[PDB]
Design a protein around this ligand. Sequence first.
Ligand code: HEM
Length: 292
Amino acid sequence: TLVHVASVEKGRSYEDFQKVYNAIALKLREDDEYDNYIGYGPVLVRLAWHISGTWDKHDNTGGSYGGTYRFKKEFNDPSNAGLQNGFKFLEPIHKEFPWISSGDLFSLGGVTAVQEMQGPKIPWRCGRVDTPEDTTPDNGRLPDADKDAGYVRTFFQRLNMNDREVVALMGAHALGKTHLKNSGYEGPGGAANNVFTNEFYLNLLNEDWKLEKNDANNEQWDSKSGYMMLPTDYSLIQDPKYLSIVKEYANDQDKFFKDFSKAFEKLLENGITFPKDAPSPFIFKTLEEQGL
Ligand code: HEM
């Protein structure tokens, strides 16, 4: 398996990264019209996950380290359709801060989005290093949505995630929406789709779901409230082990926040070796905490 050692951008420290965080956060506030006023928060979270979710624990291919989403093979992955919006959002950030690596920028985008949307603090570590075009993972490593709980469970073993980690991570599906033109699925998972809450779990348990076909001829679960769940989302209440965890997070906001924070940091760090003398993880202040 490949070794990717975190290497701090030369001479940079917490304050440098807080400035990048702030620039992302200010642009999130400014560019509010995007996606019928959802804003860019959700797509940045999805970008951070997709650049990380190519990882394979077996050989340390893929993962956030190399920033390989910048290469055509990966940005043109059908699984990544729509993420170009997140990349374009981050372009002026990268122009202002050309010293940050691509993997650091993409992952920090996700952290910033979660926190600015009132989610948990997510500790974040710098030191991802851009790797060459030939290190770009092939398409097909990101998950299908038309599958069942067994598929989800097996899929996430490749990312070294257990049942609790999987169910926690999936709570991000409160954010944003599915777009028919991107993925063949349409609609949001709830009402508060640019605020980070545990609504995904409450909606799974409390809505009256009907298995319908959308306009792309794909099945999805729909409620009269106008919400949807992917087959993979709904699988979390079909499987008895996932169901107990869904109930736990539906009943404990703080526990969900803490578990999501750990799993999301882990996701963003998979594949990276941090030297023993590497800086401790950074916890960035929100704009609100800074009075900005
Ligand atoms: C079985 C695993 C998963 C599947 C099958 C899946 C599938 C999907 C699909 C089909 C979409 C709609 C894309 C579009 O039409 O624009 C989506 C959106 C999204 N996903 Fe996932 N996802 C999974 C796990 C995750 C994880 C682990 C996270 C992050 C922790 C995540 C975060 C998001 C977010 C934030 C959106 C909304 C994007 C937007 O509004 O532009 N997903 N997902």
